[PDB]
């Protein structure tokens, strides 16, 4: 948004997250053994999902894959969910030991309210496309139309690319996995459980497919990725 400051010829090139295939290319590129067993291409799609297409954490990943085996690679894939990015933080061509030092800054500059919205987008399911109302439940605001949530979630994707906007089929945003596990070992252990319960309230009122409005009342579809936070905030 710093570009709104300039009244001039402004042109943009957005550096997207490394597509699933380019990561393969990147792996091959720095001497990485390519899979054979099915649960090895799976180990690496696990890494690409986890490190939601990110050059830097991928590099830290190789640099930290020591023996080079797919085995110790799945080891890291474990290390990432139950110790966060700190399981793979390393001396890397990046000025930063780990991506958390970067998002640090990205989070300090943020509008206080956006710092809040962000602080809450933890209690979601990662790598899942979800509706605005499904967000209106956990996201703060100082009545009946919650677009303000959308405005915030947009600033939030525009400003460090923390979210992810996707206009149709229905106005939905999405939080990736790295951008989630940042927040995991970083937001107040309380604010997590508070978001889970504060969610379980609105939770009742009266695959490559979005969750229908006949079925929002049970977020239990994402029970897996919720049982992991309930287990988390009780330690």
């Amino acid at each position: 948004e710093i570009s709104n400051a300039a009244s001039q010829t402004c042109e943009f090139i957005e550096v997207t997250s490394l597509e699933i295939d380019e990561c393969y290319d990147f792996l091959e590129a720095y001497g990485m053994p390519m899979p054979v067993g099915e649960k090895e291409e799976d180990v690496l799609n696990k890494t690409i999902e986890l490190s939601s297409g990110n050059p830097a954490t991928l590099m830290m990943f190789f640099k930290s894959c020591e023996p080079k085996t797919f085995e110790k690679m799945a080891q890291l894939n474990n290390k990432l969910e139950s110790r966060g990015l700190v399981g793979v933080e390393c001396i890397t061509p990046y000025s930063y030991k780990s991506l958390a030092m970067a998002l640090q800054r990205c989070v300090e500059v943020l509008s206080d309210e956006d710092r809040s919205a962000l602080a809450f987008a933890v209690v979601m399911p990662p790598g899942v496309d979800i509706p605005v109302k499904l967000w209106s439940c956990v996201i703060p605001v100082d009545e009946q139309l919650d677009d303000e949530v959308a405005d915030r979630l947009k600033r939030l994707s525009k400003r460090g690319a923390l979210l992810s906007g996707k206009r149709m089929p229905v106005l939905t945003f999405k939080i990736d996995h790295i951008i989630h596990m940042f927040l995991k070992h970083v937001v107040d252990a309380q604010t997590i459980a508070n978001g889970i319960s504060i969610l379980e309230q609105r939770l009742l009122e009266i695959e490559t497919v979005i969750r229908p409005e006949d079925f929002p009342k049970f977020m239990q579809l994402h029970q897996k990725f919720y049982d992991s936070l309930k287990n988390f905030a009780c330690c």
Binding site: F182, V186, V187
Partner: peptide
């Protein structure tokens, strides 16, 4: 709230 902002 935010473990030293991150």
């Amino acid at each position: 709230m935010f473990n030293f902002l991150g």
